[PDB]
């Protein structure tokens, strides 16, 4: 019922910031619209306020602003994103404006982004598996609804192809156990060409009733790149706990998000933190991640698979080393496997899930999941060691078991890991492939497999 005053007291412009003069009673994170002298419109966010002063960070840059013709019309808001159940199946810009040639969202609620945290008393341990279609993920590094598992990558590695495959093939394992699965897909600072890739994948996927592609290009303004993952997390939280639907979220290149936070912090004249990244970057990433988890009072859940780029192909970088503690896993993409032309280059042996035991079980998935996972792990290690030995022992002195492990390693690299870009694989047939590889060894040789399982499956 209050019409916000449109101050015209610009008294300083520098970089992305504009300092108003005599604003009456601002708000710290208010949102403000700017009508330049030429009539064009820009939206800006309000940073630190002071006595009658309010520094405004302006989207889309600050070119053309003049201290005698630019009006700064306040709103008195904190960026309540419009949220509704029909937000699904549409592509959205970085700031939420639809770009799918459709109408703006008619909202069932205006939820403020950066939502309040879950009460730790109300959380519940994650359970059941989430089928992704990639054998290396659903067999040896299983994923459970409620985890927060990073996908560590590096520049040049095909992170986005794996992202698209996860977005398309994701499903619920409980099909044979006896459709409330939604995939909020967030992409921060993608390249100009991969934008076409994402648009094509989300324009011919075949399951559009599930995904919601929040998209933020590289040349889009930075503050949009900060807000985009928060918008995506808010929409996912709504669709999970306010609509009782299982939700999966893929955050693409959160290293770009960290760089965006670094860019914003510097503009506020704050001293840079450790290794250049601000010290509050730990708090920011914890704020982004911890929104996941399973709530006892709600039937929904949030599972995150944030894709992170590790610069210089090492984990010592502040962002991967920092996100290692918060999360409970690491699915590395290995450069050498990409060189070896294995399309999913996931280094399975280095990769692990800190809580992969919950996904493995009797009710969910299949009984032999843990046994086959451990056997595959151990046999791969042995095969790698045997290949290394054969590199130096001439391979003539290798015993029969050494040759068995060598051929198993070759088959595992060239038939199991190298899944096609579109060869969707249910966990049951993935485990059938695992048994196909395993049955080469004698039944007595599979030491890691417990009894009553070999008799069940080793007979094929």
């Amino acid at each position: 019922l209050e019409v916000a005053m449109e101050y015209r007291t610009v008294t300083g412009v520098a970089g992305p910031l504009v300092i108003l003069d005599k604003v009456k009673g601002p708000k710290y994170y208010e949102i403000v619209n700017i009508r330049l002298g030429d009539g064009t419109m820009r939206r800006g966010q309000v940073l630190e306020v002071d006595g009658e002063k309010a520094v405004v960070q302006v989207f889309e840059g600050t070119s053309g602003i003049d201290n005698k013709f630019t009006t700064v019309q306040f709103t008195g808001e904190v960026l309540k994103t419009p949220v509704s159940l029909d937000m699904l199946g549409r592509i959205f810009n970085g700031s939420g404006k639809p770009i799918d040639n459709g109408p703006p969202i008619l909202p069932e609620a205006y939820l403020d982004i950066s939502g309040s945290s879950i009460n730790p008393s109300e959380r519940t341990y994650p359970e059941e598996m989430i089928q992704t279609g990639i054998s290396t993920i659903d067999v040896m590094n299983s994923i459970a609804r409620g985890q927060k598992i990073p996908l560590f990558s590096a520049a040049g590695l095909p992170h986005n192809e794996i992202a698209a495959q996860i977005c398309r093939q994701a499903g619920l394992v409980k099909r044979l156990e006896k459709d409330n699965f939604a995939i909020v897909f967030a992409a921060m600072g993608v390249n100009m060409e991969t934008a076409q890739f994402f648009k094509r994948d989300f324009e011919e996927n075949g399951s559009m009733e599930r995904v919601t592609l929040f998209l933020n290009l590289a040349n889009d303004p930075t503050i949009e790149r900060i807000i985009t993952p928060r918008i995506a997390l808010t929409t996912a939280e709504y669709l999970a706990y306010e609509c009782g639907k299982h939700v999966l979220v893929i955050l693409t290149d959160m290293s770009s998000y960290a760089d965006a936070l670094r860019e914003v912090s510097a503009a506020r004249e704050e001293v840079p933190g450790r290794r250049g990244y601000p010290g509050y970057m730990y708090t920011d990433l914890a704020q982004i991640y911890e929104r996941a988890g399973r709530i006892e009072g709600r039937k929904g859940s949030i599972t995150q698979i944030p894709i992170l780029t590790m610069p210089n192909d090492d984990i010592t970088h502040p962002t991967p080393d920092l996100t290692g503690y918060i999360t409970e896993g690491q699915i590395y993409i290995d450069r050498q496997l990409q060189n070896r032309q294995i399309y999913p280059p996931i280094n399975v042996l280095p990769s692990l899930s800190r809580l992969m035991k919950s996904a493995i079980g009797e009710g969910m998935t299949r009984r032999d999941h843990s046994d086959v996972s451990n056997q595959l792990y151990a046999n791969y290690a042995i095969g790698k060691d045997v290949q290394a030995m054969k590199a130096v022992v001439g391979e003539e002195a290798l015993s029969s078991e050494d040759l068995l492990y060598l051929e198993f390693l070759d088959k595992f690299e060239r038939k199991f890991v190298a899944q096609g870009a579109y060869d969707s694989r249910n966990i049951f047939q993935s485990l059938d492939l695992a048994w196909t590889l395993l049955r080469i060894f004698p039944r007595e040789l599979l030491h890691r497999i417990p009894g009553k399982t070999l008799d069940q499956y080793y007979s094929r």
Binding site: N312, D314, D385, A388, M389, A391, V392, A397
Partner: protein
């Protein structure tokens, strides 16, 4: 050596390669020792 980020990466890579080579050489030495023990038993 002059300290730099690239130098730190090179030194880390050299250490990793040295560890891998040491493991490979230990395996080769163990195999050669097994063969030598077998030859000594045969001679005895």
């Amino acid at each position: 050596v002059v300290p730099t980020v690239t130098m730190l990466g090179v030194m880390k890579s050299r250490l990793v390669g040295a560890t891998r080579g040491h493991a490979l050489l230990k395996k080769k030495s163990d195999a050669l020792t097994v063969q030598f023990r077998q030859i000594l038993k045969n001679i005895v």
